[PDB]
Amino acid sequence: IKQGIREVILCKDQDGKIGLRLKSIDNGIFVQLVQANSPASLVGLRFGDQVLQINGENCAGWSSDKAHKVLKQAFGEKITMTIRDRPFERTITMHKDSTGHVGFIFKNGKITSIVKDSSAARNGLLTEHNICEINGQNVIGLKDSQIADILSTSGTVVTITIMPAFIFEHIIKRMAPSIMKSLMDHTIPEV
């Protein structure tokens, strides 16, 4: 996670789509959903990113509705956005023990207990935090079993990006969890 504001330039696809759902949080605009194989995923937008501006207009105070409208009326060719990198999230680096364990329990993507004398304890992983990413891969909406799977088939070094559950629950509010499973970009990025 960067402490950084970056510029991205987006191009609407054949269908007029960019692959993004946005949400009003604390008078800012945040990425709720990035669609697989979209302009939004290709330029590298992520769940939890803050949209500071669209085409040089400040997003401060916008409704979710107005952000979606502004995008719909954009002139196709080139949409500029100013992005602050996942500001509600932190990344924790942990190392599996020889039993392949980092040292926590989670339910519905939420960390619920840290196991004594584990890598997760030593690194101060918190409970009541949703798992957003594992090793740079979005896992939001994946079954718990697929999250376990991704942690199994990772190397011994495990990076997990987390979000306080209260913030997470505010962002995905009014997104049916099957769009989350189905349409949230879970791909490793392209180069």
- Could you give all domains of the chain from N- to C-terminal order, each with its CATH number? 5-84 (2.30.42.10), 90-183 (2.30.42.10)
CA distance 19 to 81: 14
Comparing CA positions, the residue from 143, 141, 96 lying closest to residue 123 is 96
CA distance 20 to 17: 8
Write the single-letter amino acid at 151: L
Binding residues: 108, 143-144
Q: Which two tokens stand for residue 155?
A: 């190397």
Comparing CA positions, the residue from 96, 183, 180, 106 lying closest to residue 135 is 96
Question: Distance of CA 61 to CAs 27, 64, 166, Å?
Answer: 4, 10, 20
CA distance 168 to 54: 23
* Structure determined by: X-ray
Neighbours of 124 (CB within 10 A): 8
Question: Distance of CA 109 to CAs 41, 75, 181, Å?
Answer: 22, 38, 12
Would you say 34 and 45 are in contact if contact means Cβ atoms under 8 Å apart? yes
How many residues in total does the chain contain?
Answer: 191
- The 3-class SS string of the chain reads CCCCEEEEEECCCCCCCCCEEEEEECCEEEEEEEECCCHHHHCCCCCCCEEEEECCEECCCCCHHHHHHHHHHCCCCCEEEEEECCCCCEEEEEECCCCCCCCEEEECCEEEEECCCCHHHHCCCCCCEEEEEECCEECCCCCHHHHHHHHHCCCCEEEEEEEEHHHHHHHHCCCCHHHHHHHECCCCCCC
CA distance 166 to 30: 15
Q: What contacts 8, CB < 8 A, 6 or more positions away?
A: 43, 44, 45, 80, 81, 83
Comparing CA positions, the residue from 119, 15, 142 lying closest to residue 72 is 15
Comparing CA positions, the residue from 128, 113, 118 lying closest to residue 162 is 128
Q: What contacts 178, CB < 8 A, 6 or more positions away?
A: none
CA distance 165 to 176: 17
Buried b or exposed e, range 141-176, using 16+ CB within 10 angstroms: bbeeeebeebbeebeeebebbbbebebbebbbeebe
Give me the residues paired with residue 30 across strands: 23, 50
